[PDB]
DNA sequence: CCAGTCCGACCCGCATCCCGGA
DNA sequence: TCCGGGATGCGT
DNA sequence: GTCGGACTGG
């Protein structure tokens, strides 16, 4: 039945309740996700029988609208679902029920991101440092970049320790860090937020992310705090936030699972790059540079702050193009994707980096499995990536720049 | 894209839960 | 019982 | 995390 989901039903189109957002300019924004069923280019009504029996040749379409107050309306392309999932079993879904099951998931995840949890700050600049970072009266601060899971810790009026993630999701386990945080908040400032990283030295990102998301309390990770902020003084410049953070750890520097990262003041770009090369040789991901006057700009709407810089080695390699495919939903349906192979014959999907969507559309509509095997099979695709997968050798965070 | 800001779609890896086929 | 694949929801 | 598109006037 439709009334079991939040939202109204009008003109054969179900519209979830609009989720209110807050833009950077202080203007209200709205986001609505809708579901409609199309058969022979016609919007047919949604009946209860569609949740247990599939109407043949009928397609359910998921689309969304986003508009700022008094602004234009942005309507995404239709996410066409054409078949249910687990079609052979008891837990099988139909085309309509799977569409509402997927639309409600897009709704619940979207409601969590919008508005005492505050999204952590995010880095905008990659391997470049703006000259404005050194034109300030105070030197910028360079830190070690640990390849772990982002986490923010704060205290509630109840007294419990709240420890959430980058997407504002409360970590279930990690009890060993919650204990030290509870003991820590007995001495230090009551209403301060501790922004840091979940990490264990010499451990891969895949192992760190797994233990951070597991309900099992293995209690292995450490909390490396690199920043702090108060909710009422988000405009506090970075250098003052670093000084106050150091005074916090001068109280109790003997915590087992909570540590403060080391700050390095630099005068020019090489002093940063020399420490970057030093940190890489120590086994770290790279280096983070912080503007001295930069305030704490929370990651609302996945915003990236221009007062931070990330210095990381960008690795490249050549891979053997073997097959091709396409995206599944929305604007990616009909857009070509590359498939490369490894010495062990395992495959992976790569996205072309320097193509318009018209090129990827036209490439997929003009290619056949016979035309591909005649012209492009076996070619070399240079691929940028952050790291190689330590278990399967797959280039991770990979994108194809060309041939 | 004039940048800026924001959305939307995707890669792999892992945790978990649901299911059969053994 | 036992083990895999599917599906989902996290993370970089 | 990646990147393209597209609205915004930061």
Residue numbers in the entry: 1 to 115, 122 to 409
Excerpt from the paper describing this PDB structure:
AsfvLIG catalyzes the DNA ligation reaction during the base excision repair (BER) process of ASFV genome. AsfvLIG is composed of 419 amino acids and is one of the smallest DNA ligases identified to date. However, unlike the homologous proteins (such as HsLIG1 and SusLIG1), the fidelity of AsfvLIG is very low. By solving four AsfvLIG:DNA complex structures, including the non-catalytic open form and the catalytic closed forms, we showed that the NTD, AD, and OB domains of AsfvLIG undergo a large conformational change during the catalytic assembly.
Our structures represent several different states of the reaction: the AsfvLIG:CG complex structure captured the Watson–Crick C:G pair prior to ligation, whereas AsfvLIG:CT1 and AsfvLIG:CT2 captured the mismatched C:T pair prior to and after the ligation process, respectively. Owing to higher resolution (2.35 Å), the AsfvLIG:CT1 structure was used to demonstrate the overall folding of the catalytic form complexes. Unlike the extended non-catalytic structure, AsfvLIG undergoes large domain rearrangement and adopts a closed conformation in the catalytic AsfvLIG:DNA complex. AsfvLIG is assembled like a ring-shaped clamp and encircles the DNA duplex in its central channel. In the DNA, 19 out of 22 base pairs (bp) is covered by AsfvLIG. The AD domain of AsfvLIG mainly recognizes the broken strand at the nick site and the flanking region upstream, whereas the OB domain primarily interacts with the continuous template strand surrounding and downstream of the nick. As revealed by the AsfvLIG:CT1 structure, the NTD domain forms extensive interactions with the DNA substrate. In the AsfvLIG:CT1 structure, the nucleobases of the template C11 and the nick site T12 form one H-bond (3.1 Å) between their N4 and O4 atoms, respectively. Further, via the water-mediated H-bond, the O2 atom of the C11 nucleobase also interacts with the main chain N atom of Gln403 of the OB domain. Though not identical, the overall shapes and orientations of the C:T pair in AsfvLIG:CT1 and the C:G pair in AsfvLIG:CG are similar.
